[PDB]
Every structure is written in C-alpha cells, then in structure tokens.
C-alpha cells in the first residue's frame, strides 16, 4: 500500500488554494516560489535554441 | 574571554574558559550571553 | 494472426485514445527532429505541428489494433476518419 | 515572501514606455492605448472627458488584474478624425479645469 | 470575497492590524557517550572540520 | 499594548489622547463616551480603539531585567 | 465655468467644504489623489543601539514608523533613488535620534519631543516632531523603568501612501453628494416607510426636497458635492488640497507629455 499501489513521490506541490474570479477555467495561478522550485526537461531543439539560450 | 551576565544579581562576570557554569558571590548557574555591541539595522515597514 | 484488410470488423473511426498516442509520438519523433511533411505556416510547439499534420493525414503511422484472442488488426492512419 | 514591493505601484519600470499605442482591428478607425502605473483614478477620469466629447463614438477602459499597475482605454472615434487629438484636447480640459480650481480656491481660502 | 474569503484593508495592516510575533527555541546540548568522547560547543573552523 | 499609534482606520493620532483619557476620567470621573467626546474622537473606528484597549506593559513592567 | 468652493468648516484639523460644478470623475479622482497621491515624510530606517525595554525591537520601530513628522519643504527634498550619493546625504533625508533612561523610581515616559534634529535642513522647516497635544506632550512612544536605556537612530525619508500606510497626511474624507434623494442613485431598503427610518443628513439644509408629484428626474447629472478634508497634521488642509489638484495636473501633463512624444 505506501510503496506499490502508492507512494510518495516527487514534482508536486502542496499548499491553501483560494479563489480568483479575474482568471479563466482551467488556469491555475501558481507562486513563483513554486514556479522556481519546481522545473520541467524541455528538449534543445533548432525552434527554441534563442529562448532556451536566452533561459541559459 | 567574553562577557557573561548573572541570572538574578545581574552582575558582570566575563569568565573564560575552563571555569565551568557558575556566578561569582552567588550560586546562580544561569549566566546570560548579553547583546552585541553592534548595530542592527530595521525597517519601518 | 494479422486480420486481412479484407476482414477487418473495427470501428473505422479514430478514438480519442488512438488520436491521442498519435499526436504524443508523432510530436515526440518532431521534437526529436523528425522530417516534417506538411509546410509550416510559422509555428514552433511540436503539439501544434502534429496536430497540423493530423489535420492534413500526413503522419506516417498504422494502428495495430490488438483483438482479445490475441490476433490484431492494421489500420493506418491515413484511413481512419478523424472527428 | 513573494508578494511584489510596494513602489513598483507607481515607478515605470526599465525598458517600459507609459503609452502603448495598439491599433485595434475590431472596428474601423478604433485604437488601444496601454496605459503603465496606473488604474481607475486616471482610467474614469480620461474616460469621462473622451465621453463629453461628440467626435468619440465609443470609448471605454477596464483594469484586467489588480496584481499589476496597468489599465487598457479603447478609444474609436469619427472618419477623418484620430483619437489621440481626443486624448489631447480631454489633458488639456483637465489642466484648465484643475488651474481653475486651484486658483478658486486659493481665492476663496484668502477670504477665510 | 466568495467561499468563505475575506478582504483586508492594505493600510490597516500597515498600520499594524493583526500582527503578532513567533518565538522559536532551539535547544542543544553536548553529551559523553563513554568519557572518551566528548562533544564541544565551538565554532568549527572550515579547514579541519 | 501601550497605546496604539495613530489609528486602524481613519489614520488620526491618538497616542496623545490616553494620558489626557485617563486624567479625564481619574480626575473629572466622567464616563467613557463623555471623555471620547471631550478627546474629539468623532468615529467609532477610533473610539474602538480606546474603548476596547488592553495596555499590559504594567504587567509587563513589574519584572526585573 | 469651471468649479467653485464654499468652504464651510475651517479648523486645524478638519475643514468641510462645497465642491460644485465638477463630473463625479474629477470630484472622485480628487479625493482619491487627496488620500493616495500626496508626499509624506515618516521613519523609513530604525537603527537600535540598545535596547533593554519589555518590547520587542522591530515593534518599537514599527512605532516610530507609524510617527508623524512635519513636511512643509518637502518639495526640494529629493528622493533617495534619485540623488546619485551612496546610502543618504543632506539631499535625501533627516536624521533623527532618541536617547531614553529610567532616573527617579516613577517610570519615565519617552514622548515624540524628545527627538532632536542633529542634521542640517539647509533653511527647510521639516523634521520637527508634530505636537497636537493641550499639555505640550508629544506621542507616547514607550515607558522606561530605572536602569532601562534606550539609544537609536531614525533616517526620516520621503514616500507616498502607496509605499506604506505611513505617509498618509489626509484622515478621513466626508464626500457626500445628492442629500434628498432625487438622482435615483440609491433605492432605499424600508421596513415600514423610508421617511421613517431614515434621517435626514446636515447637507440638507443647503438644499430642499424635490417636492412629490412632480416629473420624474433622468435628465439631471451628479453635481454639488460635499467634502471635508481633516489633515493629521504634517501639512494644513490648504497644502493638502493644492498639493494635491497639482499632483492630479503633473499627472494629466505627464500623460500629454507622454502623448506628444509618439
Ligand atoms: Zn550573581
Ligand atoms: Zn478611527
Ligand atoms: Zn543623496
């Protein structure tokens, strides 16, 4: 039960939500305390070498 | 050495080291660490 | 055993599972710089460009439908009916 | 924490103009000015003197979050008339106006 | 102010609206296991440590 | 505690009423709406806040360093 | 013409006034500049020495951050970003200082006077702590017992409300317009009768009832508006205002100059 079925696992984050009528439907605001802890792989390709760069 | 504070006569010790945990003239084993003699800067806000 | 094309008895429309696999690899493949055959009007997200070649059937895939008895069938997607 | 500082309420910040001049395509000779640092106080005030005028056909500001100092005035006004006049002779009726009222009240503080 | 939510006034709390103080306590102490060791409250210098 | 500065609300100074509060009322023994009248405290967004003050610094005085 | 000004109250402290002739934008948009945009003068640093008191440190310097302080020449005084010295320097902001000990067995109270002006102001009048008070006693800041010191230094510098609540020279501002309801701007909730349950404001003795069965009203706009303005007392009620009918025009002129520049 709490290391096969489930477990605890990593790139998530957890704290109080509250409402906010100014944003869409299936947006979420998130911290940017969140937004720098937390990251995502993205793949160096020929489209983005500028923005990743840029990101560098 | 550095400046040590008395527990309840409130009297300057300034012990060394290897002198243990205790107050001169009583037998208060709480001594203080006093505040730093330097300044701390705040804000207002 | 690999059905014939002449006895294939699958629904021929694509679901959403298999539309949905099918832009994931193909915009995975063009990620990872795979030849594009549809002209690009300016994009630069990979989803967008394998969505754009779904809208055109471009993507150069085949579905191998798996039966319960353990035989399958090949349905490209060239043929299936998107929507 | 991660809430901005206080004076970025009211200071520009680096590489930021005060105007953004965007034309609209929504309706003929209509345009969008982004207005920077800013909210309702300047918004209803300028809406209001671009509302007195006849020339202004359609004329409107809204605030789309209130985390950020910024505020969008659509102005669409006649044929053969640019709406960045509006916005003019509207600056130069408020500075009369507040001159006026100024000087008013001076006048009338000097009796007291 | 839906759900339950409420709106503060940014200049009350300025002004010093429901302000309090946290006060955190670290204990620590130095122990002997069997004489021979002995932990030592010192600053540890970065070159031996 | 000991005297809030200014106001919650308004923004008026208060601190210098309380001395002058508790004068008025050891001195005149007037009620607490009579002395709040007589301070010029006009709302009760002030008067909440003499009126519902709890000054525990004597309490916190009587210690020695 | 343009607007007019009745005053009609005119005190230290709170002064109403008739603001007519003006579209609820500009009447609105001067009440808001009036509580917003406004210079101030308060504590922005607090440099504690020593401090032996019951209260906590950053609460005393929130104290004194919530100080008024005068701001007559403020207008010369320029900001801290915009003088091109490091930290501060006679250009930017005032130095103040306290210094606070227990003597006799009664406690000592530390007042707002005790603040002396050990910097030079260059023939400016601020800096000098605002005394309101009928016994000549400044802001109660702490008590002290015997044997308690308490030495700091403050940097007064400039600021607006809308960096910290503690540049707010106006209080609050009566703005009331329309005392007989005739605008049909408000439909009043009755239980029994709205004649009966709600009274009848002062401004109304400066009109009169618009009078029943007479023609409906659509065709009247918003005017005739009252407003009292009450200052702390860092600047009077007059500096107030003009500061503030100037503020909203460099504000205006700054957007034409923003326009004329495209
Ligand atoms: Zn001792
Ligand atoms: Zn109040
Ligand atoms: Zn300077």
Same mark, same amino acid.
């Given at each position: 039960?709490?290391?096969?079925?489930?477990?605890?696992?990593?790139?998530?984050?957890?704290?109080?939500?509250?409402?906010?009528?100014?944003?869409?439907?299936?947006?979420?605001?998130?911290?940017?305390?969140?937004?720098?802890?937390?990251?995502?792989?993205?793949?160096?390709?020929?489209?983005?070498?500028?923005?990743?760069?840029?990101?560098? | 050495?550095?400046?040590?504070?008395?527990?309840?006569?409130?009297?300057?010790?300034?012990?060394?080291?290897?002198?243990?945990?205790?107050?001169?003239?009583?037998?208060?084993?709480?001594?203080?660490?006093?505040?730093?003699?330097?300044?701390?800067?705040?804000?207002?806000? | 055993?690999?059905?014939?094309?002449?006895?294939?008895?699958?629904?021929?429309?694509?679901?959403?599972?298999?539309?949905?696999?099918?832009?994931?690899?193909?915009?995975?493949?063009?990620?990872?710089?795979?030849?594009?055959?549809?002209?690009?009007?300016?994009?630069?997200?990979?989803?967008?460009?394998?969505?754009?070649?779904?809208?055109?059937?471009?993507?150069?895939?085949?579905?191998?439908?798996?039966?319960?008895?353990?035989?399958?069938?090949?349905?490209?997607?060239?043929?299936?009916?998107?929507? | 924490?991660?809430?901005?500082?206080?004076?970025?309420?009211?200071?520009?910040?680096?590489?930021?103009?005060?105007?953004?001049?965007?034309?609209?395509?929504?309706?003929?000779?209509?345009?969008?000015?982004?207005?920077?640092?800013?909210?309702?106080?300047?918004?209803?005030?300028?809406?209001?003197?671009?509302?007195?005028?006849?020339?202004?056909?359609?004329?409107?500001?809204?605030?789309?979050?209130?985390?950020?100092?910024?505020?969008?005035?659509?102005?669409?006004?006649?044929?053969?008339?640019?709406?960045?006049?509006?916005?003019?002779?509207?600056?130069?009726?408020?500075?009369?106006?507040?001159?006026?009222?100024?000087?008013?009240?001076?006048?009338?503080?000097?009796?007291? | 102010?839906?759900?339950?939510?409420?709106?503060?006034?940014?200049?009350?709390?300025?002004?010093?609206?429901?302000?309090?103080?946290?006060?955190?306590?670290?204990?620590?102490?130095?122990?002997?296991?069997?004489?021979?060791?002995?932990?030592?409250?010192?600053?540890?210098?970065?070159?031996?440590? | 505690?000991?005297?809030?500065?200014?106001?919650?609300?308004?923004?008026?100074?208060?601190?210098?009423?309380?001395?002058?509060?508790?004068?008025? *009322?050891? @001195?005149?023994? !007037?009620?607490?709406?009579?002395?709040?009248?007589?301070?010029?405290?006009?709302?009760?967004?002030?008067?909440?806040?003499?009126?519902?003050?709890?000054? *525990?610094? @004597?309490?916190? !005085?009587?210690?020695?360093? | 013409?343009?607007?007019?000004?009745?005053?009609?109250?005119?005190?230290?402290?709170?002064?109403?006034?008739?603001?007519?002739?003006?579209?609820?934008?500009?009447?609105?948009?001067?009440?808001?500049?009036?509580?917003?945009?406004?210079?101030?003068?308060?504590?922005?640093?607090?440099?504690?020495?020593?401090?032996?008191?019951?209260?906590?440190?950053?609460?005393?310097?929130?104290?004194?951050?919530?100080?008024?302080?005068?701001?007559?020449?403020?207008?010369?005084?320029?900001?801290?970003?915009?003088?091109?010295?490091?930290?501060?320097?006679?250009?930017?902001?005032?130095?103040?200082?306290?210094?606070?000990?227990?003597?006799?067995?009664?406690?000592?109270?530390?007042?707002?006077?005790?603040?002396?002006?050990?910097?030079?102001?260059?023939?400016?009048?601020?800096?000098?702590?605002?005394?309101?008070?009928?016994?000549?006693?400044?802001?109660?800041?702490?008590?002290?017992?015997?044997?308690?010191?308490?030495?700091?230094?403050?940097?007064?510098?400039?600021?607006?409300?809308?960096?910290?609540?503690?540049?707010?020279?106006?209080?609050?501002?009566?703005?009331?317009?329309?005392?007989?309801?005739?605008?049909?701007?408000?439909?009043?909730?009755?239980?029994?009768?709205?004649?009966?349950?709600?009274?009848?404001?002062?401004?109304?003795?400066?009109?009169?009832?618009?009078?029943?069965?007479?023609?409906?009203?659509?065709?009247?706009?918003?005017?005739?508006?009252?407003?009292?303005?009450?200052?702390?007392?860092?600047?009077?009620?007059?500096?107030?205002?003009?500061?503030?009918?100037?503020?909203?025009?460099?504000?205006?002129?700054?957007?034409?100059?923003?326009?004329?520049?495209?």
């Amino acid at each position: 039960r709490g290391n096969l079925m489930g477990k605890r696992v990593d790139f998530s984050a957890r704290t109080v939500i509250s409402g906010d009528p100014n944003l869409e439907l299936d947006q979420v605001g998130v911290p940017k305390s969140i937004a720098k802890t937390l990251t995502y792989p993205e793949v160096v390709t020929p489209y983005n070498i500028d923005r990743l760069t840029q990101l560098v | 050495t550095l400046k040590y504070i008395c527990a309840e006569c409130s009297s300057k010790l300034s012990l060394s080291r290897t002198d243990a945990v205790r107050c001169k003239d009583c037998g208060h084993r709480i001594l203080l660490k006093a505040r730093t003699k330097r300044l701390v800067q705040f804000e207002a806000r | 055993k690999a059905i014939p094309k002449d006895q294939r008895a699958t629904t021929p429309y694509m679901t959403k599972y298999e539309r949905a696999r099918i832009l994931g690899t193909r915009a995975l493949q063009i990620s990872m710089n795979a030849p594009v055959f549809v002209d690009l009007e300016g994009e630069t997200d990979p989803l967008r460009i394998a969505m754009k070649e779904l809208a055109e059937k471009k993507i150069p895939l085949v579905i191998r439908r798996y039966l319960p008895d353990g035989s399958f069938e090949d349905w490209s997607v060239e043929e299936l009916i998107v929507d | 924490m991660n809430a901005p500082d206080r004076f970025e309420l009211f200071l520009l910040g680096e590489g930021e103009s005060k105007l953004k001049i965007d034309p609209d395509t929504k309706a003929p000779n209509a345009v969008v000015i982004t207005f920077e640092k800013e909210d309702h106080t300047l918004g209803n005030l300028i809406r209001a003197e671009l509302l007195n005028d006849r020339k202004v056909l359609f004329a409107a500001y809204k605030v789309e979050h209130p985390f950020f100092a910024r505020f969008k005035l659509r102005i669409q006004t006649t044929e053969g008339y640019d709406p960045k006049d509006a916005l003019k002779n509207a600056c130069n009726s408020i500075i009369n106006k507040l001159g006026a009222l100024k000087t008013n009240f001076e006048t009338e503080w000097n009796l007291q | 102010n839906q759900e339950d939510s409420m709106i503060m006034n940014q200049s009350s709390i300025d002004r010093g609206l429901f302000r309090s103080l946290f006060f955190r306590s670290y204990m620590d102490q130095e122990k002997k296991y069997g004489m021979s060791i002995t932990e030592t409250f010192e600053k540890p210098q970065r070159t031996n440590t | 505690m000991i005297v809030p500065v200014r106001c919650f609300s308004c923004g008026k100074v208060v601190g210098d009423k309380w001395e002058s509060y508790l004068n008025l *009322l050891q @001195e005149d023994e !007037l009620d607490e709406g009579t002395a709040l009248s007589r301070l010029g405290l006009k709302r009760y967004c002030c008067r909440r806040m003499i009126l519902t003050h709890v000054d *525990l610094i @004597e309490k916190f !005085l009587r210690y020695n360093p | 013409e343009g607007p007019q000004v009745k005053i009609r109250e005119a005190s230290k402290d709170n002064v109403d006034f008739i603001l007519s002739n003006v579209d609820l934008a500009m009447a609105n948009s001067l009440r808001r500049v009036m509580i917003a945009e406004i210079p101030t003068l308060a504590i922005d640093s607090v440099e504690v020495e020593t401090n032996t008191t019951v209260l906590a440190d950053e609460f005393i310097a929130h104290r004194l951050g919530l100080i008024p302080l005068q701001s007559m020449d403020i207008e010369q005084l320029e900001y801290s970003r915009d003088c091109f010295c490091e930290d501060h320097c006679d250009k930017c902001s005032v130095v103040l200082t306290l210094q606070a000990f227990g003597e006799s067995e009664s406690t000592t109270n530390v007042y707002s006077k005790d603040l002396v002006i050990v910097s030079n102001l260059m023939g400016r009048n601020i800096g000098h702590p605002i005394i309101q008070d009928k016994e000549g006693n400044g802001v109660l800041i702490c008590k002290l017992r015997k044997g308690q010191e308490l030495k700091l230094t403050c940097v007064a510098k400039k600021g607006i409300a809308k960096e910290h609540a503690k540049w707010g020279p106006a209080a609050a501002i009566e703005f009331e317009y329309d005392p007989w309801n005739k605008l049909k701007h408000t439909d009043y909730w009755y239980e029994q009768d709205s004649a009966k349950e709600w009274p009848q404001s002062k401004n109304c003795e400066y009109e009169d009832p618009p009078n029943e069965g007479d023609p409906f009203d659509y065709k009247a706009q918003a005017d005739t508006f009252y407003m009292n303005v009450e200052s702390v007392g860092s600047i009077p009620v007059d500096q107030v205002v003009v500061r503030g009918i100037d503020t909203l025009q460099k504000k205006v002129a700054s957007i034409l100059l923003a326009l004329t520049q495209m």
